[model samples]
Target: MNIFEMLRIDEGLRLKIYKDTEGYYTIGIGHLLTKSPSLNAAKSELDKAIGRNTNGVITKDEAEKLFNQDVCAAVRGILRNAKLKPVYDSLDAVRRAALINMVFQMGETGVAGFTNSLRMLQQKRWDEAAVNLAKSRWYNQTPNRAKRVITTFRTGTWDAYKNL
Candidate 1:
């Protein structure tokens, strides 16, 4: 599994701030930011790095390597958060992964705001947890993704996503 080949560009959109197919800001190949204006944010990030120029070519290896490092850190942050651990540790491995994915999608703050949902989850109430996830704005934005999250909690089982 060459991670570099896992993400590629058809003709290279490097050294450019571009909008993705869904119109989100994306830079240096397929790295999609968490929200809109991702390109601007990426440019800001580019400015912060001493020698990381937005005008320099970003290779496949470069993009995927950075991506792999960054997402793992992001995922681990929530998985390790002391404030989040009480409930995080109470859940089974599968539920923990679902929670991890949700936090990855929206960050820990996003999941933190769902007091009822987190409460239900902490209580090990599968039915309520499923319903809570279904009714949230998270579900409203992407029912498809929310459904996968919901089903994971609802079934008390997580089958690894085929398209994950």
Candidate 2:
């Protein structure tokens, strides 16, 4: 099933998916909502929590403990699922992780608006895809996550996000 299908989010929740004036997703998980220090740090925290519960799988409860809500897990779960592997496999790990981060913050349909970038990616046009990826309404919007993500795509480094 698609990520949205799994989330069961309606239009009401859809519109609620914005950062506050403080640039926090009121609906997101722990570190994700607060915009954690680094993606790696966020992932590491999640990994350790997930590992502790290890039935070799991350349950919704465990995910919530780590992320503080189902939304973040639903997003990450969708990305981790095999059905979404094609999309994940098309980009370098950095770009893929960055995209997943965006999806986690923006939600599925919100991120779906990036049709041109997704199309470029589908066609394997990496450079054009990267440029298109940087042109979203979300770009430079919040705590400047879009700019940070775009920079990661362009320069292939998460280092620029240190100050965010």
Candidate 3:
């Protein structure tokens, strides 16, 4: 199934899943649904807390305030160890956002822990990245969510990753 189908977002499960997370506030979903944020907002809020942003763009000061040393270290590790910057630099905005979302959710070490996938991506292997993404712990842990993200990465179809 495609990524959107896997996440059940197409089936209207986005808010449901977000709500079920418990730590997330309803207002957060409301913000995401009503006013879509840019990459900057996502980078700031998601990198730090769930409801930290007031608008689409996150200020550098705000981003610094929300930063966690451990989380920053872990995210830096993903950028450095996984050799993902090149891959990330090569992707389109949509795919890059999806990858960033995964990184934000899973942490760099947790995401990069997918050794095979990291290897494939480092080698610029698109097909293998898709395959390895499916074989990841995150994929197996949240098959629905992972599949949706993976489908978007594979097909470049702006379906599931849009509208949060």
Candidate 4:
């Protein structure tokens, strides 16, 4: 039920800089180091956190610290949304992890766009929610991860994930 481990699995750890699916410079689990206001600021903040010039790489401890910070922001972002807060409060920890995972991948605004799916989830209509999730472009782009998240939403368990 820990969102941290769930996201560590979903995001995949990375110590070196790399391009994400959309070509954004990323490092340390899914931390987008590009234009998060600006790459320079982001990198500077990262360097401050790790107390060294990363150049292009960070350590595991640094990565987890960044991941935890990102996770906290994601949780707060979910709470800040008027619509999502209610649904987030209504779900169990596993289901909440699914929401956090989605927000982690796509910003909170992106997940908020799933209007119908959110409604289904609020209604506890698991099958309908799964159907709604599958219909999205998010689902089309990352069916594998989306499938597992949807399954978590449906089954309310972590069985669909591994090494968690």
Candidate 5:
């Protein structure tokens, strides 16, 4: 079976809004309510859309659809909110993806703190950007993650990510 199919099956199905063991209100497979306010807002949204005290729910298929949509919207949000503008857009897909991944981990506000790194990116100084990325406390927090992203920023190619 394909990955999607496997996920569909393994994730199983839920027909009503319920809190998981962790206490987050969740519905539609395993889509966490807090995953994004950009999408379902799973609880309050349901309260508004359906009715107060009604069971806010979604189908297994709706979960996947909404999950993918949320992810897409989130990535797009990073692109929209991140600095470097046209220069950021000008980067190759792999490099852009790596940067977006960083933004996802750090949030736009957090990544924006990479003032030097952002400047290096805007200057099209790939090596400098890589160096700046490496200098951050984030680098030490996650082993080799910064290195992989740094390589992608410098090389702008899948090869840099693969060779690691």
Candidate 6:
């Protein structure tokens, strides 16, 4: 499956602002509104985008727009990391989506901390890469999503997320 399709399943779309599993203010397919600021400004922006007082609500189209922007930012973030580009380039589409998914969830710096896993991925050591990922705190924090990502890496295929 494509990156967007995978994300649609993993980061389900929401028209209302809500706290994520980790209690971060989020909306529109995992788009984090803020990690440390008040939600007033973010709510205002969403209200203005829809041309009305949404009262913490947004349109599906607006959500899709935000989703697209966030996804693109995640991709650009990964690509811009000098050490990530070469390894990212060597991956197939499915595997590339897996890498992008991690960056999308944790940010570039967070993913960069997976040094051994990244090295294993770069070497195409599928199982080893998956193993390293499975051993992380990220795995414990989001087991279901982490399992799917790990399986994708282990198999170098999209089967893991296909039924999602």
How accurate locally, in lDDT, is each candidate?
0.62, 0.51, 0.51, 0.87, 0.61, 0.85
Off by over 4 Å in 5: 1-67, 82-84
Give the distance in Å from residue 2's predicted Cα in candidate 3 to where it truly belongs: 18
Clashing pairs in 4: none
lDDT of 3 by residue, 1-164 (tens): 33222223322323221322323321221222222234443445453554644544444443333334333443465468545666666776656555655665566656656667656654657677888788666787778767767766776566655556
Using TM-score as the measure, which candidate wins? 6
Over 66-122, each residue of candidate 2 has an lDDT whose tens digit, in order, gives: 443454564566466544445566667566656666666666666666767766664
Cα lDDT of model 5 by residue, 128-154, tens digit: 888778878888876455676677778
Evaluated at residue 143, the lDDT of candidate 6 is 96
Any runs in candidate 3 off by more than 4 Å, and if so which? Answer: 1-82, 122-124, 161-164
TM-score of 5: 0.57
Question: Candidate 4 regions off by >4 Å?
Answer: 35-45
Q: Which ten residues in a row have the lowest lDDT in candidate 5?
A: 1-10
User: How close is each model in CA RMSD to the real structure?
Assistant: 5.7, 12.4, 10.3, 2.5, 7.3, 1.9
Higher-scoring candidate on TM-score, 2 or 3: 2
Per-residue lDDT, model 2, residue 35, is 61
lDDT of 1 by residue, 3-116 (tens): 122222121335455665567655554455436454556666654542465453456556655556545665677767765677788877677767766765577877778888
Q: Candidate 1 or 5, higher lDDT?
A: 1
- Global lDDT for candidate 4? 0.87
Count steric clashes of candidate 4.
0
Q: Could you arrange the candidates by TM-score from highest to lowest?
A: 6, 4, 1, 5, 2, 3
Q: List pairs with backbone clashes in candidate 5.
A: none
TM-score against truth, every candidate: 0.65, 0.50, 0.49, 0.90, 0.57, 0.91
